[PDB]
Design a protein around this ligand. Structure first.
Ligand SMILES: [Cl-]
Ligand SMILES: [Cl-]
Lengths: 233, 236
């Protein structure tokens, strides 16, 4: 249940735990939650009301952004990519980034290639939900997906880092999970390797464990676009 | 890196020799300067190939899709870009002196400080362009001063000379090129309210790696004059 304006600050993070400040429908926070689960890290999730934030939350992030990690030593780490990096380095078990410094750099280069997708998927949703023109936004998204399709086809591997899932896949996933409910699943109709990747991801135990309830997510979006503040509670 | 640039019509470089790494650069590019600092700090054996940015070699788009610098090219034909990813790759791939902290939190904190710096490169460029063209600069300078105030707060809170503690580290080298340029850009006045930052500037100038790559002010002044005069020799 989300904490907002009026909520008491949480206590210190206990030794042996790490805390993530999140919101159940935030795709950036979804990234970091995937990495936490995939590495079997003991953690607690504190959800934040993004419309009416707790004033104390600005002591966690100066602009009240999520996700933020808080450690038992009162250290704050943000935002999603830096947090995922930290978790992979700080918790030795099941390394998600590659062993090879070049391959790690390549994954970060792939992440840069992906940089327009979050904005484009969001703008697609807003356009479709507001009845505004979406042809250009979908065309732009299809082009970014073609760039990713070319990588998978060239490599001839199911995932972006090889035959097994790795950090880069989890970093991209949240926006692909959302294509269906956003009404833009048709934007991968020209990219068969990407469609295989989507399925491969759904079969991943960590992805499967964190899959959103589609009906609840639709309910959230409906109240969000009604400007109803209760959408964030 | 005091060599002439390769431009349109030039021939592609051959394979990078075993034991070397190649950086595609330009002598006055601050992003490339960042990566050259890391190469020097770690004593990595390397070759610098300067690219004519006004008149780029056709083959250079096989190194970066949009002809950006810097790009690292390895002896295994691998390409790594741009400056932040290249610097991290260098620090992790090469032994000896390590520039990032070993502690995962301290390393993450350095990445967070880099994010805090993200507006400075564009603001410094915009300030230069405004001053050189005689356009409005009050609000651009105020914006830059605010970004510098954020950095000042970090140094004052930590009570350390450098951004990563009491000695120089990766984060300092990542920020340096734009601070080196304040003088010739004509915006040294934008650190007049930030005394910790002014102390840091001096600490950086005293660093052997920084000092080794420090640009001669007169040559840099000449480059900017040629650049704003639209003289093609600026990029030679
Ligand atoms: Cl599927
Ligand atoms: Cl000085």
């Amino acid at each position: 249940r989300t904490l907002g304006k009026g909520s008491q600050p949480p206590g210190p993070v206990p030794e042996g735990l790490i805390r993530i400040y999140s919101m159940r429908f935030c795709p950036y926070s979804h990234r970091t939650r995937l990495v936490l689960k995939a590495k079997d890290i003991r953690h607690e999730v504190v959800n934040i009301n993004l419309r009416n934030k707790p004033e104390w939350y600005y002591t966690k992030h100066p602009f009240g952004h999520i996700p933020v990690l808080e450690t038992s030593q009162s250290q704050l780490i943000y935002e999603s990519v830096i947090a995922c990096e930290y978790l992979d380095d700080a918790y030795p078990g099941r390394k998600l980034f590659p062993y090879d410094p070049y391959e790690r750099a390549r994954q970060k280069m792939l992440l840069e290639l992906f940089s327009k997708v979050p904005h484009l998927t969001k703008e697609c949703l807003v356009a479709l939900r507001s009845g505004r023109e979406s042809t250009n936004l979908k065309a732009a998204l299809r082009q970014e997906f073609s760039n990713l399709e070319e990588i998978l086809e060239y490599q001839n591997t199911t995932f972006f880092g090889g035959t097994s899932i790795s950090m880069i896949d989890y970093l991209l996933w949240p926006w692909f999970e959302r294509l269906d409910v956003y009404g833009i699943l048709d934007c991968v109709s020209h990219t068969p390797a990407l469609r295989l990747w989507i399925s491969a991801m759904k079969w991943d135990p960590t992805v499967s464990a964190l899959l959103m309830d589609k009906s609840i997510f639709q309910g959230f979006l409906n109240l969000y676009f009604q400007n109803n503040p209760n959408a964030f509670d």
